[PDB]
Design a protein around this ligand. Structure first.
Ligand SMILES: NC(=O)c1ccc[n+]([C@@H]2O[C@H](COP(=O)([O-])OP(=O)(O)OC[C@H]3O[C@@H](n4cnc5c(N)ncnc54)[C@H](O)[C@@H]3O)[C@@H](O)[C@H]2O)c1
Ligand SMILES: NC(=O)c1ccc[n+]([C@@H]2O[C@H](COP(=O)([O-])OP(=O)(O)OC[C@H]3O[C@@H](n4cnc5c(N)ncnc54)[C@H](O)[C@@H]3O)[C@@H](O)[C@H]2O)c1
Ligand SMILES: NC(=O)c1ccc[n+]([C@@H]2O[C@H](COP(=O)([O-])OP(=O)(O)OC[C@H]3O[C@@H](n4cnc5c(N)ncnc54)[C@H](O)[C@@H]3O)[C@@H](O)[C@H]2O)c1
Ligand SMILES: NC(=O)c1ccc[n+]([C@@H]2O[C@H](COP(=O)([O-])OP(=O)(O)OC[C@H]3O[C@@H](n4cnc5c(N)ncnc54)[C@H](O)[C@@H]3O)[C@@H](O)[C@H]2O)c1
Ligand SMILES: NC(=O)c1ccc[n+]([C@@H]2O[C@H](COP(=O)([O-])OP(=O)(O)OC[C@H]3O[C@@H](n4cnc5c(N)ncnc54)[C@H](O)[C@@H]3O)[C@@H](O)[C@H]2O)c1
Ligand SMILES: NC(=O)c1ccc[n+]([C@@H]2O[C@H](COP(=O)([O-])OP(=O)(O)OC[C@H]3O[C@@H](n4cnc5c(N)ncnc54)[C@H](O)[C@@H]3O)[C@@H](O)[C@H]2O)c1
Ligand SMILES: O=C([O-])C(O)C(=O)[O-]
Ligand SMILES: O=C([O-])C(O)C(=O)[O-]
Ligand SMILES: O=C([O-])C(O)C(=O)[O-]
Ligand SMILES: [Mg+2]
Ligand SMILES: [Mg+2]
Ligand SMILES: [Mg+2]
Lengths: 553, 553, 553
């Protein structure tokens, strides 16, 4: 580092607090600016964990923990590192959604880069304003589809901020190499538009060509400063834009859309674990999605990709997938429009056309039900019992977020199906003890199990473009870590507590994969990928800031 | 110092070059950015002296020495400290004059603060731009009367730059507590106006109320940022303005005029010493100046002041002084105009009116002749032979600078009067050996003998305004240091080799005087003035940049 | 740019002098710190050229131009650009060697990075100390074979500084992306060892493994901070080490040796041109080198590379080349040893063994004579007259530097062979007018025609390793720019005045080549190489530093 004195205390990337040794203190000119006591990170964490236990509401705790990050980065990740399983719900879903829902009211210090449509033509001057000079990963949003909460405009910057947090907390990507970005083109949320605390532009969402230049000007400005192979992960964009931007840049830049492909990998991994227990014939497999958007279409494809790879032709596989959106079942010739991506899963209409999802479930008789509408409890007990009746061991995936927008709860799933089902939820749900003593621990089908390890590998391997197979592999690497004993208690995914090692494990297998497919451009090719990855992960342990002083002979 | 790395080297105020000890190098991040050798200031000064010897021209030497000032401040002053008497003619008169004459051609790096009439109304933003926060001394010019060279416009910034050099070199005034300023309101110098290299406004001198308001705004802006008692020394302004500004601000700010008052002190000191060898009766004294501007009136003033303190009434004192300017003898009722300041020295015309200065010397028959017209060799051999005939020991002062503007040379003074005369010149002149073997070492009547010492006192004493009697006392304190032996060799002033110690001794005498007259506001009053002063002179030895590291009990 | 105020003027990479516009002065906090005048780069260079035309000696000039670089970088390259042909001899051979010869005496401000054997184990800390964080090209030396001046220790940093100047002055490589490095491991020059001004370690050259460790620690340190394909150009190392390191790193890093491969490329281009005038049958070709080190071996091998490319087998190619070193002709069975590299040109002794070069010339009767011993005038008139007698059109190359160590002069060559020869020198020589009115313009066989454009292409194409074919192509690309009429005046090389375009042209021909050979890794591959290259060349014109201020809708 190049600065000394107070500036080392103000910069959270360098600030250690009373953890600065007396040498550093005296040496860097901090002596007298800190109390005579010299703490350890151990104690600093203690003070936090003790102060946090006294808090009552999650948003109060979210404001607290996120405030460390703007104070002392290393202690902040040490805090997360100490108990990820418990800080997850606060720093990530569901509390992150409640946070964005009132970002402008709890705003203290700003985080991330902000790019509004009012800066069109100068997106590069802004980019150049970012303090970090070696960014490797960018997570971008326009806040049109923030979780299942809809259009939150600029109030949505809490999403990329919380995702990049997991980048470091789970895969150990360097914090100073990540960059959260929020593109402000207006908002259609009228409540926000009449809110004095709104942080974005007081205008409705611009949907013209002006919008497309902007993302273009952005993509180009970013790569022009940080490199052509900078990882750019699109997050929570509208359905229309997510797909068109993914198809627009996936081959131009190193980009991927978490909501489309990240979600695919995790659901496929969970579905894969489920087959481990059901061992049902690939032929008698039938899946019905609640929703036909980004996630549904992404999961659908990756699933067909696993089927193809397992025999079933692309066609015979797609015929195993049905989708039910806000207008009903996707069937050929329906009044409601079907897009390019849906075509493949739109079939000739069944005998009777379902009016309700419970109808679809009874007409189709699916073996798997995956909710991805973000519309609420659409998996009524009638739907669940329906499934429980149709399937000895039905697979129910309630993946919408946050919790309030989930299709159903761990509670209802297990209870209504009498502990026969295979439950998975996008948001956290506690274990479920049944009258008859049995206890089920539900897994969390969240992309957070994929995107950190998959971003690690892509960065470390200097990959140029992310192919969809990479996510097929990352799904296998994930489900390859589920133990028969973890499987034993209802978990379709490895314990969240072990997410850091799982991530790392995924990143390794994925790099191995990239190199093996001539997709990794880092030279030379490490002989031992495992060692290559672990040797490169960022640690939260304070680093010495003392000058290199040595004697001359 | 609060910086580290390359910046310490870029800043000449902190730069040591190869003198940065190895520890400083490693601790301040300079290791690798400097050659493996660790020199001593002593070696550094050798390199310089070794190099300067190879140089043929003074301007080439000036460009070189002034260049250390913009590279290594400590080394630069060390260099001057090494041999002030030989470096003076270069860094100062006469070489400075020649440097100013083409400042625009030899420009490398800018020095000082520049304020042009075009910045009117914003002078304070400019002042706030100065990097140094605790200025205590300012030397300012508008370049209208640069030495005897006339209006040189912004090319005259070399003057304030050199006066402040001799502030530190002679009196040990901190270099970062000094600020040379240039007020560019245009120039009347046709040549510079048609010169592509000129550094100021291409416009005739602004002599409207716009100018007076600029000076005012400057005086205010400066004191507003640094203090009401900040020392402002006016240098080389036009006759009219010099007086106008001095009367206007001498009681408002802590300011003085060097050309008027600094000159007066030195011509008095010299005149005092001369009287020691002559011991002529006060009644018989009769002085005649060649010139009647700033210096002549400033000296005529202090002379009269002495005479009054030694009997004579101010009225009869004045009557012993005569003046002869570009239009001839100042006499009551002459056609050319006399002003407020010259009226006391404009007398009823003599029996015959002198056409030339030689005529004056013969009609008037003065004991002392003080040249200060800045017009060249006006003290013709005849003027000289005339004086030696009129007086046994004539007193001849050729004070105009630079050397080419001087009224005569030592060589002419001594040889033409047969070593009888008592000479002093404004510019440097070497010893003169007469054919009869006698060797006379002329003294230099230059205000550099006065301003550095007076400035240090006024600063250290937190004095608010500088009265004329303070320059009277600085004259006594200067003459009181001339030894009989030095007097014996024709020196009317202490060797210039001892200018540093002469200056500090004058500093102490003036401080003693200030506190004695209730004009010093520094509390508490230092019991021992002498030590108080020497205790606070800036030294040229490299200081340590290492931090204050020490173990804890 | 992230800094305002004085720091912008101190940093030469940003400083514009009086070239800062009034808007920038006011906006960046420089108003008042610069004279009221606003100059253009055009007048700034005018002042320089005018000031320089007054200087008498080249070292005094070299000191003046190199100081501009430490004051205002863009103006420095502007003056260079203005007349490269005239400033070449000063900023480069022969004045650069003269400067090096007494680097410690003319030392003003440090340039480049220094790494001594005493920093072994902390080389990374030294590199981390370098202000620029995006270096792409490095020119490193140990001052062991500085030109034909031998061991100059650290006084040799002048060389890597000057080479990196031609990088920018000729191929428009960004100055801030270049890093000159000097490795001080001691020196054997006793004259330096007892020199009080010497800037390195007062110890004899360390030649143990500790030396190999250091070079290795540097190689890693460098790539660690700036990337695995950072260009590292070894310059003027000892014969043994030059080859040792080339063989050792050429495949691990992106490195090359200027003295070895550079010279090869430039001599082959000159030879090639000469073959255009001679048309001699490949069969009848016979080459004899004066010297058998870095340069000779490097040229020898590239010559062979070309003959084999045109029929001749490697074996019969080598048979055409003879070398005469300080011990005499390299023949099989001689007492003076022969290394691995010379083995190929160490033939069975001729009839009569030559004791002098003149003998070798008359024994062997070569068609081409290439002096590269740096031992002085060894191409005696007798040696020349002999060549003119043996060959109607003899090819004489006096490639040693500086001019004093050159084998012979242009005048000697042309005059003694009566304008029949084909001359090329490694140092500048004026045209030669023969008594019969004929005027010859000798070419300059200096690698300066090669290393810039080649470095540009390698940098631009992100090449990982530099093959020897690259230099073959660079030779063709260079000789392909010589014009009939240019040849017509005896030029075996394009005029030096066009050195910039030539470089760029060679740069493009090489990247086209790199790409065509799958040796460039910059993604994606530009369709039009020409535009791609001119697109990215650093320009000497001042860039605006004004922030991007724009109105919001
Ligand atoms: N768990 C994870 O890893 C993860 C990842 C990404 C998105 N999600 C969640 O998935 C939900 C939807 O996101 P998306 O990207 O698929 O959105 P989208 O807007 O692209 O698609 C939503 C789909 O659900 C349909 N729908 C809406 N209301 C419906 C209703 N009442 N009945 C039936 N269908 C209805 C819509 O027609 C649409 O096809 C969000 O709540 C989001 O939080 C979860
Ligand atoms: N001050 C600076 O600008 C600076 C300082 C140190 C290193 N660097 C860069 O780092 C590279 C040196 O290679 P290396 O050993 O660091 O990695 P590497 O070459 O093994 O890995 C390849 C890429 O992965 C990135 N990377 C490695 N670990 C990362 C992590 N934990 N989180 C996010 N990104 C990570 C690297 O930046 C690199 O571009 C050089 O290309 C250099 O430009 C820059
Ligand atoms: N970083 C800073 O801003 C800084 C640092 C050290 C001291 N100071 C100032 O210095 C004063 C401390 O008292 P002191 O004992 O040094 O002085 P002092 O009280 O004995 O002297 C009186 C005045 O003369 C000035 N002075 C002393 N030596 C000087 C010199 N060699 N050249 C030019 N001016 C000189 C002082 O600034 C002071 O204003 C305080 O007023 C303080 O504000 C400021
Ligand atoms: N040695 C020192 O310490 C010192 C200090 C200040 C000024 N000076 C020198 O004194 C000279 C004048 O400065 P000033 O401030 O008195 O200037 P000024 O402009 O105030 O006055 C100059 C006077 O000289 C007169 N004059 C000009 N030419 C004359 C001539 N040819 N014959 C007779 N009289 C003539 C003018 O009429 C005018 O009255 C300058 O050359 C200056 O360098 C020396
Ligand atoms: N502040 C910074 O750290 C910063 C700022 C701007 C650009 N960059 C870097 O520059 C690259 C952007 O692409 P580009 O259009 O500059 O080049 P490019 O991608 O077309 O060229 C490929 C390589 O050539 C280098 N290069 C280009 N011109 C050069 C020149 N004139 N002299 C020396 N090297 C030159 C680049 O550094 C790059 O690594 C990115 O890799 C980015 O990391 C870094
Ligand atoms: N013009 C260019 O572009 C260019 C480039 C690189 C080197 N050079 C010059 O080439 C010269 C040598 O460089 P190098 O790297 O080849 O050196 P080197 O030390 O590797 O080889 C020098 C050779 O000259 C021989 N030699 C020495 N004295 C001799 C003598 N008196 N008679 C016959 N042979 C003698 C040595 O035996 C040795 O074989 C230097 O003067 C250098 O300036 C020129
Ligand atoms: O961000 C997320 O956690 C997920 O992609 C979602 O939208 O639910
Ligand atoms: O500047 C001086 O040294 C003096 O006041 C003069 O004007 O000659
Ligand atoms: O560096 C040079 O100028 C050249 O390679 C030489 O050694 O003569
Ligand atoms: Mg999301
Ligand atoms: Mg003056
Ligand atoms: Mg060389």
């Amino acid at each position: 580092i190049k600065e000394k004195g107070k500036p080392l205390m103000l910069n959270p990337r360098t600030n250690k607090g009373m953890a600065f040794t007396l040498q550093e203190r005296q040496m860097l000119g901090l002596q007298g600016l800190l109390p005579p006591k010299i703490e350890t990170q151990d104690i600093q964490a203690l003070r936090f964990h003790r102060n946090l236990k006294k808090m009552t509401s999650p948003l109060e705790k979210y404001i607290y923990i996120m405030g460390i990050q703007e104070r002392n980065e290393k202690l902040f990740y040490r805090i997360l590192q100490d108990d990820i399983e418990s800080l997850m719900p606060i720093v990530y879903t569901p509390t992150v959604g409640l946070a964005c829902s009132q970002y402008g009211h709890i705003f203290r210090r700003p985080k991330g880069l902000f790019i509004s449509i009012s800066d069109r033509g100068h997106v590069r001057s802004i980019v150049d304003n970012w303090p970090e000079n070696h960014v490797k990963a960018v997570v971008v949003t326009d806040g049109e589809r923030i979780l299942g909460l809809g259009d939150l405009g600029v109030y949505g910057m809490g999403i990329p901020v919380g995702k990049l947090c997991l980048y470091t907390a789970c895969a150990g990507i360097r914090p100073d190499r990540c960059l959260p970005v929020c593109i402000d083109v207006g908002t259609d949320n009228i409540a926000l538009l009449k809110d004095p605390f709104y942080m974005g532009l007081y205008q409705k969402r611009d949907r013209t060509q002006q919008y497309d230049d902007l993302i273009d000007e952005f993509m180009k400005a970013i790569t022009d400063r940080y490199g052509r192979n900078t990882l750019i992960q699109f997050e929570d964009f509208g359905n229309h834009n997510a797909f068109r931007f993914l198809r627009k840049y996936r081959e131009k830049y190193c980009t991927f859309n978490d909501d489309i492909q990240g979600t695919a990998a995790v659901a496929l991994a969970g579905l894969l674990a489920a087959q481990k227990v059901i061992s049902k014939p690939i032929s008698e497999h039938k899946i019905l999605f609640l929703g036909a958007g980004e996630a549904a279409l992404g999961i659908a494809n990756l699933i067909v990709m696993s089927m193809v790879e397992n025999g079933l032709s692309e066609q015979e596989a797609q015929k195993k997938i049905w989708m039910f959106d806000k207008y009903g079942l996707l069937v050929k010739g329906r009044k409601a429009k079907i897009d390019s991506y849906q075509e493949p899963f739109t079939h000739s209409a069944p005998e009777s056309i379902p009016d309700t999802f419970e109808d679809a479930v009874n007409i189709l008789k699916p073996s798997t039900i995956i909710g991805v509408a973000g519309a609420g409890r659409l998996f009524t007990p009638d739907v669940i019992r329906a499934m429980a009746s149709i399937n000895e061991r039905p697979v129910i995936f309630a993946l919408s977020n946050p919790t309030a927008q989930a299709e159903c709860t761990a509670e209802e799933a297990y209870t209504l199906t009498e502990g026969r089902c295979l439950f998975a939820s996008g948001s956290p749900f506690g274990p479920v003890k049944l009258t008859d003593g049995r206890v089920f621990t539900p897994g969390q089908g969240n992309n957070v199990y994929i995107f950190p390890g998959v971003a690690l590998a892509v960065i470390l391997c200097n990959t140029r473009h992310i192919s969809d197979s990479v996510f097929l592999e990352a799904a296998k690497a994930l489900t390859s870590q589920l133990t028969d004993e973890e499987l034993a208690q209802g978990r379709l995914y490895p314990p969240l507590a072990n997410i850091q090692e799982v991530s790392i494990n995924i990143a390794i297998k994925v790099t191995e994969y990239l190199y093996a497919n001539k997709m990794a451009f880092r030279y030379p090719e490490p002989e031992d990928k495992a060692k290559y990855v672990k040797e490169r992960t960022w640690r939260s342990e304070y680093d010495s800031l003392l000058p290199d002083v040595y004697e001359w002979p």
